[PDB]
């Protein structure tokens, strides 16, 4: 199916959000749309081997981003990694969500 990272992940949250304004410090204040999607659009959670994690950025109605956060650590801890990674403007536009 096209599940958004639902079911293991919440709408954006106060810390998922806040890197929307770190690392996306124009994402975050660019799409300016008159509703809330200036931020993190939700971050789902699953292990793997270090704990995997799929942060979805949200950047507006027309603007989007995402991410995949890794706290690679498969016994071996090499340091993590990010599998996700996304800017906005129309790439990672896809409304997800129950």
Request: aromatic share 8%.
């Amino acid at each position: 199916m096209i599940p958004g990272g639902l079911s293991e992940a919440k709408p954006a949250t106060p810390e998922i959000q806040e890197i929307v304004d770190k690392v996306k410090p124009q994402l975050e204040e660019k799409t300016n749309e008159t509703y809330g999607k200036l931020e993190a659009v939700q971050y789902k959670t699953q292990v793997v081997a270090g704990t995997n994690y799929y942060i979805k950025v949200r950047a507006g109605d027309n603007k989007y981003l995402h991410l995949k956060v890794f706290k690679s650590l498969p016994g071996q801890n090499e340091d993590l990694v990010l599998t996700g990674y996304q800017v906005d403007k129309n790439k990672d536009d896809e409304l997800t969500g129950f």
